[PDB]
């Protein structure tokens, strides 16, 4: 009934924030205020496209 | 009464009964065609209405 499309390994390569839970929570408030433009556009695309494979970038 | 009474009157009996006869035969077959194909005003069975569904954004993205 069709194919499954998923971007190859090289596409989903990126260094991840390697800090732990407490670090993120402590800086979460200031992180939300500063880096919201990338957050808002990412999750808006997540809810609109309704597919991570079209929102990996 | 003469023969024009019973003659024209019996005509009326036959014509009315003939139209009634053919309407019945049409109804039996119309009812059959409606129940089989379903593309008709009657013989339609309840389906869940769309307005019950909710389009508001949910907690999870993928919905």
């Amino acid at each position: 009934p069709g194919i499954v499309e998923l971007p190859t390994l090289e596409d989903l390569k990126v260094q991840e924030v390697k800090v732990s839970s407490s670090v993120l929570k402590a800086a979460a408030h200031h992180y939300g205020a500063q880096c919201d433009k990338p957050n808002k556009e990412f999750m808006l695309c997540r809810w609109e496209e309704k597919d991570p494979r079209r929102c990996l970038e | 009464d003469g023969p024009e009474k019973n003659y024209e009157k019996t005509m009326a009996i036959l014509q009315i009964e003939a139209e009634k006869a053919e309407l019945r035969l049409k109804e039996l077959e119309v009812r059959r065609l409606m129940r089989a194909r379903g593309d008709g005003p009657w013989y339609q069975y309840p389906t869940i209405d769309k307005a019950l569904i909710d389009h508001s954004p949910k907690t999870t993205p993928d919905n």
Side-chain angles (χ1 to χ4, degrees), chain A residues 12-52:
Chain A
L12 66 171
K13 313 223 161 315
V14 58
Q15 166 279 17
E16 310 96 329
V17 279
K18 297 309 299 311
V19 302
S20 191
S21 60
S22 322
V23 152
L24 292 147
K25 190 157 203 153
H29 272 53
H30 285 275
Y31 167 65
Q34 290 336 94
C35 288
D36 49 33
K37 280 284 161 25
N39 294 357
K40 281 317 159 63
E41 70 91 20
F42 173 60
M43 186 187 337
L44 179 273
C45 100
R46 263 318 302 279
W47 252 256
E48 280 204 352
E49 302 253 22
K50 300 222 165 127
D51 201 342

Side-chain angles (χ1 to χ4, degrees), chain B:
Chain B
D1 230 316
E4 61 284 291
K5 171 60 134 22
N6 197 87
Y7 209 78
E8 147 187 356
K9 170 135 132 202
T10 306
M11 262 214 179
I13 307 279
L14 266 304
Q15 172 248 11
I16 296 263
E17 269 262 19
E19 301 196 351
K20 176 170 324 167
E22 62 93 56
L23 266 203
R24 284 159 128 138
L25 283 199
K26 184 183 323 297
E27 187 270 329
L28 261 296
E29 185 270 345
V30 161
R31 199 122 80 77
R32 197 264 309 297
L33 212 59
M34 204 135 283
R35 195 176 181 138
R37 324 208 295 221
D39 55 337
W42 71 41
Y43 255 110
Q44 268 191 5
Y45 294 47
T47 88
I48 295 115
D49 168 320
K50 38 222 308 173
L52 262 283
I53 84 162
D54 190 19
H55 316 119
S56 46
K58 315 272 196 329
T59 72
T60 79
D62 249 15
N63 280 137

